[PDB]
């Protein structure tokens, strides 16, 4: 009856909002490209507060954290490649021969022994040096003359070899007055009302791994193997599957390389590939045929729920495009592998090994181009020794064609971050609340 | 006792969550120019701005340093005709803001002048 307005400060009510999310990291100290030393240390007690009775709406396909991480990672790379060497003198006519013939037909030319004239510390005196270049990084002229692949499109910048391309888990945090909402639903689709919700100040550790087709070193599902797409009935929307069991992959570049520093000027030093100690072998990846067949069947079962128990789905290899998207391209110890995946997506499944593994023939690039703008590329300096990384495959990036056929791909860098930021959402706190009661001032 | 944590009573009734206001009150506020450094500086200036806008409104209403202040603005039933028991023992603060959202600007003015006139009345009473 006698009701007046009463103001409350600190009411549990929030609205959806976009804000700047700062990074948190764990104490590890050289320096990585992700500048994880420049982040605030994460609390050793990552507080999670469960929001009982709360049901929130999520939409990973409109989430801004994936749009903010997509640009932060690009900025972290632009920042790290800023003070490094500009290899513009490397855009010169190369005299190339095969290095060490008699291997296996079209394999001597996969990497070349290229010699070229180069500037020195004195601008008036040249030097004739040589370097081992992979075939994917050079093109002919039409004689045995070659040039770097990037010279007619993009400038080139070699990474400061003291920086590490190793991904370090990143914790995105919301500023004070904001909150991160986690959808703790074990069988969550990515959109819609999430019944179990908790709030956190910072997200979990998110390694900024940029792979293709296969999602590496990611987070796993707790139940079944979920499948996420905004319009699954649309064939042009990438399907982002996420395993619950990690199917291990073993990649290696067995060639024992040597890095030969070449001074291209005062202070500037281009790191060439000296020679190969030992055998000239082929880089490849192993994945247990048994575990991959088992995990490929789980995806089939969860794909039946969107296309019928009776339909037949088929896995085919990539249908074309750039090199980074037709292969399982990724980074392993510094070198950038490009793995043929025809041996992983070559299976048809009906309506209703056990010892060996399936190997993946991988090629290697050094002049890797930029994924966004054109006119820019990076020279990955050669890594000495033998490279062999062991990583988990926790998801895929498939694509339907409109009985059913699924091929992989995904050159978009933000699809990787959707696979880890799907369960998070940014909201702003509005602690002012007016409501009636029979209370009056004075 | 209970202590549900920060926003722990977001799904609780308005009368229940109205007893855990200090929980949300203390979490509303707690240089190299790198990509992370610029990011963190923006998070710092934004937090102090949002915190002081609410403290400003809390000041022009005569509610400085109050979690629960009572006003003199009567409840126009056109805002919400719901009774007290079906509000504090029923609704949550989230859905309450959802149906009072249209009139939140109307109320913010009535509280602003009720405080301006009250302090003018208090000066007249202490003038003797």
């Amino acid at each position: 009856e006698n009701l007046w307005v009463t103001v409350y400060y600190g009411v549990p009510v929030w609205k959806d909002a976009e804000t700047t999310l700062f990074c948190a990291s764990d104490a590890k100290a050289k320096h990585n490209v992700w500048a994880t030393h420049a982040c605030v240390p994460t609390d050793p007690n990552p507080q999670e507060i469960h929001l009982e009775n709360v049901t929130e709406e999520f939409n990973m396909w409109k989430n801004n954290m994936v749009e903010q991480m997509h640009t932060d990672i690009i900025s972290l790379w632009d920042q790290s490649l800023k003070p490094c060497v500009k290899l513009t003198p490397l855009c010169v006519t190369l005299q190339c021969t095969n290095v060490t013939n008699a291997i296996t037909d079209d394999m001597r030319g996969e990497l070349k022994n290229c010699s070229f004239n180069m500037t020195t510390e004195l601008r008036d005196k040249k030097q004739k040096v040589y370097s081992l270049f992979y075939r994917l990084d050079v093109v002919q002229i039409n004689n045995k003359e070659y040039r770097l692949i990037n010279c007619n499109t993009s400038a080139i910048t070699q990474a400061c070899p003291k920086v590490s391309f190793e991904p370090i888990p990143i914790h995105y945090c919301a500023p004070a007055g904001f909150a991160i909402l986690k959808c703790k639903d074990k069988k969550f689709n990515g959109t819609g009302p999430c019944p179990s919700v908790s709030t956190v100040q910072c997200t979990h550790g998110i390694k900024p791994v940029v792979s293709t087709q296969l999602l590496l070193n990611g987070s796993l599902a707790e139940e079944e193997v979920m499948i996420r797409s905004e319009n699954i009935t649309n064939n042009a929307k990438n399907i982002l599957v996420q395993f619950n069991t990690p199917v291990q992959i073993n990649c290696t570049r067995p060639n024992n390389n040597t890095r030969k520093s070449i001074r291209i000027g005062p202070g500037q030093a281009f790191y060439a590939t000296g020679d190969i100690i030992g055998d000239i072998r082929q880089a490849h990846c192993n994945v247990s045929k048994a575990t991959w067949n088992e995990t490929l069947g789980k995806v089939v079962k969860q794909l039946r729920k969107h296309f019928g128990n009776n339909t037949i789905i088929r896995f085919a290899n990539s249908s074309g495009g750039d090199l980074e998207v037709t292969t399982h391209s990724f980074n392993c110890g510094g070198e950038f592998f490009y793995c043929n995946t025809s041996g992983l997506f070559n299976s048809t499944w009906i309506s209703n090994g056990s010892n060996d593994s399936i190997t993946l023939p991988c090629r290697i690039k050094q002049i890797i181009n930029m994924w966004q703008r054109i006119g820019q590329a990076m020279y990955a300096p050669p890594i000495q020794g033998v490279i062999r990384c062991v990583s988990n495959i926790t998801g895929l990036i498939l694509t339907r064609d409109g009985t059913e056929t699924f091929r992989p791909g995904g050159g978009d860098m933000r699809d990787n971050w959707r696979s880890e930021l799907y369960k998070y959402k940014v909201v702003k706190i509005e602690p002012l609340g007016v409501a009636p009661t029979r209370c009056k001032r004075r | 006792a209970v202590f549900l944590g920060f926003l722990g009573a977001a799904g609780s009734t308005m009368g229940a969550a109205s007893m855990t206001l200090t929980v949300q009150a203390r979490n509303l506020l707690s240089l190299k120019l790198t990509v992370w450094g610029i990011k963190q500086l923006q998070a710092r200036v934004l937090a102090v701005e949002r915190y002081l806008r609410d403290q400003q409104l809390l000041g022009i209403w005569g509610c400085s340093g109050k979690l629960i202040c009572c006003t003199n603005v009567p409840w126009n039933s056109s805002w919400s005709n719901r009774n007290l028991s079906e509000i504090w023992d029923n609704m949550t603060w989230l859905q309450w803001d959802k149906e009072i959202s249209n009139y939140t600007q109307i109320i913010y003015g009535l509280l602003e002048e009720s405080q301006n006139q009250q302090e003018k009345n208090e000066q007249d009473l202490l003038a003797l």
Partner: nanobody, 128 residues
Framework: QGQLVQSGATTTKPGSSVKISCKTS????????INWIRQTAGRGPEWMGW????????????????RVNMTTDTEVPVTSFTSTGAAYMEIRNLTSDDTGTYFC????????????????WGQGTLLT
């Protein structure tokens, strides 16, 4: 809003055990109790018992202490404040003297002294 569609009005004979369904809509099914009320012809209307779709805690009259099984399945979130639920009712040593119209009614408020009070009822089901 809120709806509570009930099952069919079929009939059986003594000694059996029928199940009554009550499907909810337009309100968070977990926030209010579900009551079962009986309007017999040879007796005044009787309150059989309520159950909590949130805590699973049930409470029935001693006249139905060991003869009635009340169960509810978890809800399905529709929006932030809308879900769909279902409540089930059973009888054990059943005769033909329990004939009448059976209703399901959700609780009144979420807190206070009239929490479980049957507020929003269903359309009822005729029995044997």
């Amino acid at each position: 809003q809120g709806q509570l569609v009930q099952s069919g009005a079929t009939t059986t004979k003594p000694g059996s055990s029928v199940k009554i369904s009550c499907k909810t809509s337009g309100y968070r099914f977990n926030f209010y109790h579900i009551n079962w009320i009986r309007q017999t012809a040879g007796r005044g209307p009787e309150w059989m018992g309520w159950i909590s779709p949130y805590s699973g805690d049930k409470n029935l009259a001693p006249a139905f202490q060991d003869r009635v099984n009340m169960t509810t399945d978890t809800e399905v979130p529709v929006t932030s404040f809308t879900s769909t639920g279902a409540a089930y009712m059973e009888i054990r040593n059943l005769t033909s003297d329990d004939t009448g119209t059976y209703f399901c009614a959700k609780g009144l408020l979420r807190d206070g002294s009239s929490t479980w009070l049957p507020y929003l009822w269903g359309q009822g089901t005729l029995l044997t």
